[PDB]
Structures are given as structure tokens and as C-alpha cells.
Design a protein around this ligand. Structure first.
Ligand SMILES: [Ca+2]
Length: 240
């Protein structure tokens, strides 16, 4: 997250760290959201590589024992059948990870609330982006969980020639674009939490940013719109 601030510990308890085995070590690669005690929602391009993954829940400081962590392996990866690795702008940037074990829910570890299918936000709707990704373009991972206030940019605006044009599809959400705050590499797959009916729900899965850089005026961060995938999500969880 560019332009964020440190989150409080219990602030976003559905946030996960998606990590891969790097020798004898594990590196954070992506965010996710915990959607069932044994299911994680992330971006398909996070799991494009045949790596060995694991999920950390109740995580706050990547480098340090928090006393809250749970570490679980990944048993099965379900990428959207239509996802195309060479065309992120075609959308379908979404995957479901079935965990080797069911995590324990507590105040550090909760399920994410998803929106009703079809739900679209108004322009300038109050959302936060969370994650451990790069805190500047070409920069480094955050040690601690960062949050940034990142209001939505509607489709009519985001798809106009000034902003993203054609690159962006109505199956996506844009948020931010002020030139200051943004998502950045390592935040992909994580949540965009939006306040609706006095609740935070997860409206986005962080998908991409500009090639120019993370925080670029008039290039909001682009998310997979979760409300477009509700029936797919439920149909996977129901039959797996
Ligand atoms: Ca830790």
C-alpha cells in the first residue's frame, strides 16, 4: 500500500498473507480474504506459478511473532475457468483456495462478509485497501499491515479515456487514483473493504495498477468486483 498508515491489530481480521516456499524460507507474495474456516479468496494471478503455498491468518508483523498467527497449508486451488494469464485486463482475476485445515475463529481471525450478487457502489464510496505490499513504487514490502482510505471511482469515469479507458471492464472496481494512495505489488489478491449498511464488506480483490507506477494520478487501483462472482463462489464451495 502506497500512502497508507499502520493498521490496528484487530482491525481487519479477515485479511490473510499468501506465502510461498523460497528454499527453506517462506515469502509473502499476496493478500487474500478468509471466506470460510477452510476457504480463502485471492486473485488468480497470485497462484499462476506452481509453487508451494501457505496461508497465514491473524498476522500483523511479517517479521515478528505476534502471538496471534495461525499457519495452514493449501490443499486445492480453484482458479476461475476463464482466467487468462496473458490478459489480466480481460478480468476473471479470482481464485479460491481450500485449506489443508479449518482455522480457529477468534478476535484476530474472522470471516470476511461478501456483498449480495450484482451490487454496485456509488461513485466516491468509502473503502479501505489493506495489505503488506510495496510502500512506494519499486520499493519494499511493509513489515506491518498497512491501510489506505481509497474511495471508489465509478465505471463511467474509470472507463473514460483520461483514466483507464477500455482496459477496465464492468466486472472490475476502481478505487483511488489521487496520485498519493494506492495499492502496489504484494497487495494483489487482498481485500478492498467497503462500508455498506453500517458494515464493512469485501467488494474487491486487488488485481492490478499502472505500468507507470503504483500511485499515479488518474490511474486508480483496479479490483476484481466480487459481486460479479457470488454464484461462482458459492458453486465451488458447495461442490468441493
Ligand atoms: Ca507475525
Amino acid at each position: 500500500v502506497v500512502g497508507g498508515t499502520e493498521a490496528q491489530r484487530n482491525s481487519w481480521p479477515s485479511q490473510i498473507s499468501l506465502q510461498y516456499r523460497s528454499g527453506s524460507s517462506w515469502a509473502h507474495t499476496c493478500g487474500g480474504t478468509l471466506i470460510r474456516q477452510n476457504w480463502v479468496m485471492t486473485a488468480a494471478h497470485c497462484v499462476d506459478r506452481e509453487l508451494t503455498f501457505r496461508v497465514v491468518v491473524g498476522e500483523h508483523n511479517l517479521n515478528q511473532n505476534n502471538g496471534t498467527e495461525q499457519y495452514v497449508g493449501v490443499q486445492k486451488i480453484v482458479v476461475h475457468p476463464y482466467w487468462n494469464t496473458d490478459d489480466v485486463a480481460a478480468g476473471y482475476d479470482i481464485a479460491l483456495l481450500r485449506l489443508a485445515q479449518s482455522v480457529t475463529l477468534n478476535s484476530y481471525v474472522q470471516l470476511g462478509v461478501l456483498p449480495r450478487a450484482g451490487t454496485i457502489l456509488a461513485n466516491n464510496s468509502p473503502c479501505y485497501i489493506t495489505g503488506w505490499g510495496l510502500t512506494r513504487t519499486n520499493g519494499q514490502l511493509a513489515q506491518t499491515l498497512q491501510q489506505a482510505y481509497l474511495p471508489t471511482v465509478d465505471y463511467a469515469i474509470c472507463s473514460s479515456s483520461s483514466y483507464w479507458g477500455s482496459t477496465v471492464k464492468n466486472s472490475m472496481v476502481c478505487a483511488g487514483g489521487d496520485g498519493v494512495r494506492s495499492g502496489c505489488q504484494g497487495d494483489s489478491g487482498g481485500p478492498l473493504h467497503c462500508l455498506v449498511n453500517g458494515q464493512y464488506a469485501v467488494h474487491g480483490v486487488t488485481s492490478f495498477v499502472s505500468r507507470l507506477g503504483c500511485n499515479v494520478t488518474r490511474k486508480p487501483t483496479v479490483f476484481t468486483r466480487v459481486s460479479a462472482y457470488i454464484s461462482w463462489i458459492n458453486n465451488v464451495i458447495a461442490s468441493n
